[PDB]
Design a protein around this ligand. Structure first.
Ligand SMILES: *[C@@H](C(=O)O)[C@H](O)C(=O)N[C@@H](CC(C)C)C(=O)NCCCCNC(N)=[NH2+]
Ligand SMILES: [Ca+2]
Length: 215
């Protein structure tokens, strides 16, 4: 794998969204990974709809939370997911209103990254594209993060609670990092992004629940 990669630079990443108060981080994380694969396979960069996943992925619990693997499994079974235009985010649970006419991507399965393995994660990011991951996002320091490579020793790898998107990795000031796209709006962090310490004993559990959709 290359020393660094940044998928934002290749145009594989849509703009930063804002999930609001709904517990739908898992939906934003999922469409982020599907959006990456869509661009890589078609050349089109398009917003896919997290609302579609929130209302329809019945293995999950809407605004009460969910998993990305369950979301990819839904898109495969359903034979598609709508675009954001065809199924707009409203930040609260509604009945399923999927319309195949608005279908913008498909999914033929998903793959998990070996638990805790940051090197497999790096290679997945290098080979595949943006990868859905989960972290401990509960610390005050994460929430008020503004710039630099994030590291806080109180972060708990066994307390995953927030799903994000790994869109690259690199190194700043001799500190290795992952480039992480969050869903708290473009004002948060560095334009809605965060560089999180890489190769520091799986900090924040970034490699504990990673996965990506097959397309
Ligand atoms: C994340 C967020 O909006 O900030 C959001 O609360 C979320 O979904 N968290 C996940 C945990 C990460 C993906 C590690 C969540 O808590 N999943 C478990 C939800 C409980 C499942 N219930 C049903 N019926 N499946
Ligand atoms: Ca499942």
């Amino acid at each position: 794998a290359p020393d660094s990669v940044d998928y934002r630079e290749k145009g594989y990443v849509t703009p930063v969204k804002n999930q609001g108060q709904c517990g739908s981080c898992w939906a934003f994380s999922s469409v982020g990974a599907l959006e990456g694969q869509l661009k890589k396979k078609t050349g089109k960069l398009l917003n896919l709809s997290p609302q579609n996943l929130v209302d329809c992925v019945s293995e999950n619990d809407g605004c009460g939370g969910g998993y990305m693997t369950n979301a990819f499994q839904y898109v495969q079974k359903n034979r598609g997911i709508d675009s954001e235009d065809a199924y707009p985010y409203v930040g609260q649970e509604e009945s399923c209103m999927y319309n195949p006419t608005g279908k913008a991507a498909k999914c033929r399965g998903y793959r998990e990254i070996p638990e805790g393995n940051e090197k497999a994660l790096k290679r997945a990011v290098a080979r595949v594209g943006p990868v859905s991951v989960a972290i401990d996002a509960s610390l005050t320091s994460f929430q008020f993060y503004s710039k630099g490579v994030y590291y806080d020793e109180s972060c708990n790898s066994d307390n995953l609670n927030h799903a994000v998107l790994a869109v690259g990795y690199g190194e700043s000031k001799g500190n290795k990092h992952w480039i992480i796209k969050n869903s708290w709006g473009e004002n948060w962090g560095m334009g809605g992004y965060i560089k999180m310490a890489r190769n520091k004993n799986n900090a924040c559990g970034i490699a504990n629940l990673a996965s990506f959709p097959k397309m």
